[PDB]
Amino acid sequence: SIGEPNRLLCWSIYVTKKPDQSEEDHHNHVSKVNAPMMIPFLKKYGIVRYTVKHNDAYSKPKQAALMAGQPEENVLAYDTVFEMIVKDIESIQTMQKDEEFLRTTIPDHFNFADMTRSKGSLTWIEEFTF
């Protein structure tokens, strides 16, 4: 019954925006509509931290200057990345079975995500703050 201790986990979702949609629209929906919607469920299931990472018109010129010289192929091209730190997987498995979470959030994904081109990652992490 003794087991390897639980390490901090990061659950990350990589979102490509809908083809027709504009960057403004995608990013507005995510920060203004989809984020307030998610906050409640994350609190409830004991998510440590929630980070939304934007690669939009504000970051891309900073990105082009920092990575000048690199081929476009060496850039990760997702419009948004959502990241949730949790202490254990069961937090997120239970939230994925939440009928309320699902009927709320799942149809909203069709307003900003191309699901044929989105990805997920569940990692254990080492974090250092300075």
Next chain:
Amino acid sequence: RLLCWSIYVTKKPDQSEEDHHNHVSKVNAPMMIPFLKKYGIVRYTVKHNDAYSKPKQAALMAGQPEENVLAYDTVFEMIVKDIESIQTMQKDEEFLRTTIPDHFNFADMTRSKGSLTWIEEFTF
């Protein structure tokens, strides 16, 4: 707006998972911390997609096509207030002297990627 400098690495093709992640945590990471501190770096997060996380990833993503899995072995995240903090570090000759050759010990540098993003963050 805080920024996130993210590097996505696939292990060297003739290297085991065990060795990749051992190298990253024990060799690369203590090499990097001094430089990250010294420049303006706020937070450094190493994410590991190895045999500890993969069974948890599979349980959680059960049913989904394998193509939906992000395939990188390690992901390195640097929070900074400006790109200038990363640039200054990437022109430190002792940083370059030591960290570049170390990349050849863990990363397949044909299949690595970077991203720079601005972040929204809510702590609970």
